[PDB]
Amino acid sequence: LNLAEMEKVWLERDERALEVTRTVSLAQFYQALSSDNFNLTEKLTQFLR
Amino acid sequence: LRHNLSIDGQPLSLAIYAEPTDPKALLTSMVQASQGGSAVLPGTLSLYR
Question: Which residue of chain A is at minimal alpha-carbon distance from B44?
Fold first, then answer.
């Protein structure tokens, strides 16, 4: 009975959620950061040096 | 002499047996009842097939 209740809740409150894909660039994100905005590849090359 | 008995009081006429009515049998029978159905709940349409 508990399993049937679980299945009933699942099949009633089931909702096909909207699927959204977002592309994020780390360089642009770090360059447009609100607090610490900096050049990602410049900092990477400096740290590698 | 008045009560029509013997010399020792024995009745001169034999008392009737007075056969009883005797008991009778008893009977029982079946009893039925009727009911209706429950209200049909509108099934929440899922997404499955």
Answer: A12
